From a paper:
Bacterial transcription termination factor, ρ, is a hexameric, NTP-dependent 5’–3’ RNA translocase and helicase. A ρ monomer contains N-terminal (NTD) and C-terminal (CTD) domains connected by a flexible linker. The NTD comprises an N-terminal three-helix bundle and a five-stranded β-barrel, the OB-fold, that forms a primary RNA-binding site (PBS); the PBSes are located around one outer rim of the ρ hexamer. The CTDs jointly form a secondary RNA-binding site (SBS) at the center of the ρ hexamer.
We subjected SEC fractions corresponding to ρ-Rof complexes to cryoEM/SPA in the absence and presence of the transition state analog, ADP-BeF3. In the first assembly, ρ forms an open hexameric ring (ρA-ρF) bound by five Rof molecules (Rofa-Rofe), while the second assembly represents a ρ pentamer (ρA-ρE) bound by four Rof molecules (Rofa-Rofd). In the presence of ADP-BeF3, we obtained a ~1:1 (ρ6-Rof5:ρ5-Rof4) distribution between the two classes, whereas in the absence of the nucleotide, the equilibrium was shifted towards the lower oligomeric assembly (ρ6-Rof5:ρ5-Rof4 ~ 1:3). We built an initial atomic model of ρ-bound Rof based on the density for Rofc in the ρ6-ADP-Rof5 structure, which is best defined. We therefore focus our subsequent descriptions on the ρ6-ADP-Rof5 complex and on Rofc when discussing interaction details. In each case, Rof interacts primarily with one ρ NTD through its N-terminal α-helix (α1, residues 9–23), the loop connecting strands β3 and β4 (residues 46–50) and the very C-terminal region. In addition, loopβ3-β4 of Rof contacts the N-terminal three-helix bundle of the adjacent ρ protomer, presumably explaining why Rof binding is only observed between neighboring ρ subunits but not at the terminal subunits of the open ring. The N-terminus and helix α1 of Rof are positioned in a cavity of the ρ NTD between ρ helix α4 (residues 83–89) and one flank of the ρ OB-fold (residues 95–120). Surprisingly, although ρ adopts an open conformation upon Rof binding, the connector retains the NTD/CTD-interaction register of the closed conformation, presumably due to the direct Rof-helix α5 interactions restricting connector rearrangements. Concomitantly, in complex with Rof, the CTD Q-loops adopt a conformation observed in closed ρ, but not in open ρ structures in the absence of Rof 42; in the closed ring as well as in the open ring in complex with Rof, ρK283 is inserted into a pocket formed by the Q-loop of the adjacent protomer, while ρK283 points to the center of the ring in open ρ in the absence of Rof.
Author numbering:
A (entry chain a), B (entry chain b): 3 to 84
C (entry chain A), D (entry chain B): 1 to 418
The structure:
Amino acid sequence: DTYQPINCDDYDNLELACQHHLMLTLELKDGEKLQAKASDLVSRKNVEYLVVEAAGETRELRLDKITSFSHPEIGTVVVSES
Amino acid sequence: DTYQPINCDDYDNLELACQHHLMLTLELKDGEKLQAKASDLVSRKNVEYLVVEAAGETRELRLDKITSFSHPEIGTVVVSES
Amino acid sequence: MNLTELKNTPVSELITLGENMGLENLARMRKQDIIFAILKQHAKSGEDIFGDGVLEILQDGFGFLRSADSSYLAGPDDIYVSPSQIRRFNLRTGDTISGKIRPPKEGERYFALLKVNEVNFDKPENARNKILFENLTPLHANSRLRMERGNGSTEDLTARVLDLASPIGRGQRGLIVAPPKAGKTMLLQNIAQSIAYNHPDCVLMVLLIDERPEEVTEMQRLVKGEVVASTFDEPASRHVQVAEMVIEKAKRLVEHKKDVIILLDSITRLARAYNTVVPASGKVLTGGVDANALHRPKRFFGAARNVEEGGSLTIIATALIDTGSKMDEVIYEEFKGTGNMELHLSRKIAEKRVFPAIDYNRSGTRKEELLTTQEELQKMWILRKIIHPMGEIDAMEFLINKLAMTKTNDDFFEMMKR
Amino acid sequence: MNLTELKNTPVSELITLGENMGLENLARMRKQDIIFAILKQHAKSGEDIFGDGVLEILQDGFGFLRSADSSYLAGPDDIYVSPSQIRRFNLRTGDTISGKIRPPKEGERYFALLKVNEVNFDKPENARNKILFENLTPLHANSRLRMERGNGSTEDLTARVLDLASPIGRGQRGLIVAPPKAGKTMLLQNIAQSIAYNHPDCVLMVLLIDERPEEVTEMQRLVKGEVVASTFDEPASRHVQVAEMVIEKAKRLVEHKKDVIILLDSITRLARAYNTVVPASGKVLTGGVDANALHRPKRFFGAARNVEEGGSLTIIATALIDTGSKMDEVIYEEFKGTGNMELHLSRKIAEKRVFPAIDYNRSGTRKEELLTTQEELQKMWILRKIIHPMGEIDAMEFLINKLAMTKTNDDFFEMMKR
């Protein structure tokens, strides 16, 4: 469907977490908790993409496929659903 | 018999070797390996020449005849065929 | 409603606005406190809040969305934008960003951007793939800006004289040579009003440098377009930073195929401001003006061009001559032949209370063929063939009466013949 | 991919080409940055890259190849030349080097030369045995460059009038003296058209200094040779750099027995630019012109010569007079008696809208008997006797009227006999 841009708050936090080179917990639709690592965001044709290198499969997934994420070091951040 | 000038990158490395006077490992087209100290780069009759000495060998040989050279501090360089 | 609406709300209205919305306290005289409380109350209640501003990228790495109403002056209400957002959407200085605004967190002295909605009056996706201004190929001004109101009023007389003396086209790089007492201010007001009347589509903008606050107030009331100015009491750094903000915004609009018109008053003061801020390179010209100082104003003046792809930038600047300081005149000669259009003002004509005090013998544009039609070209050719042999002071007297007896310059041209 | 064709590609097509490779956000950066970004991506594929340019040797010792498309402006796309290569091949500033390129490595911010296979459009081993320009023997011009085209067009009148007044030969050191509004630009454009049509073998270069950005664009459209210009919004050092690159490049071509023609506009602005850059010497003439400042423009203007061996260098530089600046008058004073050919434009003739506004009586050439034949020279003397009594305005009107009805200068002479 149509892509939507994320807010400035979570975008800054997501980049800061990736820039800090610390593993962050990520959850999927199945509810599995994985301490995955996100390298950076690649924007092709005005579409944002994310790759997880923790598992080694480096799958290219959209930024709208993540329910929520948190960091043990800092306060939890919730991505706005709309 | 016509001389083929070497690439600019190869010439710069050899001149840097000649200025530093390092014990390069020279091997020719036939595969004759010898270790000598580079002294200077000269040109005669539009033909570039390299003078290398090993225990006072001060021999003279063409640049294109050299196939590759290496040093402990400088990576191995393979000259282009043309 | 937005932050702009709350900022310009009348004091009586906002007090009534606070009471009906259920504000805890209405005894806060400072408007900064009350707007912060309202925005926080809206934010904590879950109601979205939006804001708009003009981006200014600082050398540190982040930027502030300045507001044009305050003449882009720094303030606590300026919206902060993180460097991550700038790199994400490829924002440049002068871009206008409107979108959802986040209340400040702990330690944040300014409101921080929450979500960007529109960039340069366009969606961010389609505004990040516009060709840069420097890559645009300049062209001569072909389509002209008619400034004749066509109403017959005495105010139209000045516009009609300017139309005959020197046509103005979109993309022109004009210059206005004026002695200190020549009615420069009234001429500028007429042009700005005429542009809005004749060409509402073109984006109008007026920049005043080193001007009294009283002149700023009347300009905003008169000129329909955005008016930005800097008072004389402000430091020279303020003059430099306000001029760069104006030109940067103009370039961004031009990249969107938008015709932008800038009226400058005065280029001499702007050049003077740059002289006192740039470091001395050891080579100083006569008059105590650094040679490298004039490079920056020429960059501002040289941006006026007509773009082959679309849009244009028209800069009309006033140069002060014979003000008693030799710094002004040596600056003026550096702009002698840098403009397509020039207009001179005669002090002696202004002495006789004759307005406008333009010097017809020393005014015109470099290529009138593109702007004017063939029939108009000959009529102007004939008209200048008559004024040139005779004097200049009586020429203005000849011009004003002849245009007065007629209604439109087209009617004036035909009545001159036979 | 060849670099020179990449720069000729329009920026809009580069975005399409760049996005095809997968690069993003390249629409908001300058064209030079786009070219550098594109090349790096293509270099990652391992394919060979070909580039070319004009060598400029900095004071440090290393050199850069700069393209004439961007008027030899420093940029990321420039190719780095190591100091060893400048000694391996005996290279001077202005040499045109063509060869393979390699992508930058760690610590390198520029592309580097890989294999030279062409110097000055010749083999590298043959371009190191060319005698220097300074060692050549100057001579008077003896080969005529005929501006006349013979098509009978109205624009051909300017060329025909030029031949009658001031014949131009290979190696001439011309000087066009022009008031501000004498149609100087149209005169230069007409000369360039004649050179590109009558003499396609001669290398044509047009050098514009302190020119308006719109004027630069039109020259590149209608000039078949090479146009390099520096706009008035650039630092004075940039004006010096482009002039040095043009003259040095011209000298290298002359060493290969080629006819090079340089159309300079103007020597006045070039001398003014050198006045800023050159440090003060303590002897300041009137108008603020340093004594040593004028030395460099004399070197540029004095290079025009007819080499005794093959090749020649023609320089036709325009001069500005009565512009209201004392500095301009001083500069023109020092260049008064240095040119073999002088062509004077009259403002009075320009006012009457009669073009070309050439002052026939004050314009001529030295040693004109060498350029033309005996019969043609005798006819030219007859015409000068007729013109001499008449005034400047009368002569030009008389000349064109008797010249319009004839399609060739030779036919005009035959008609004038009877």
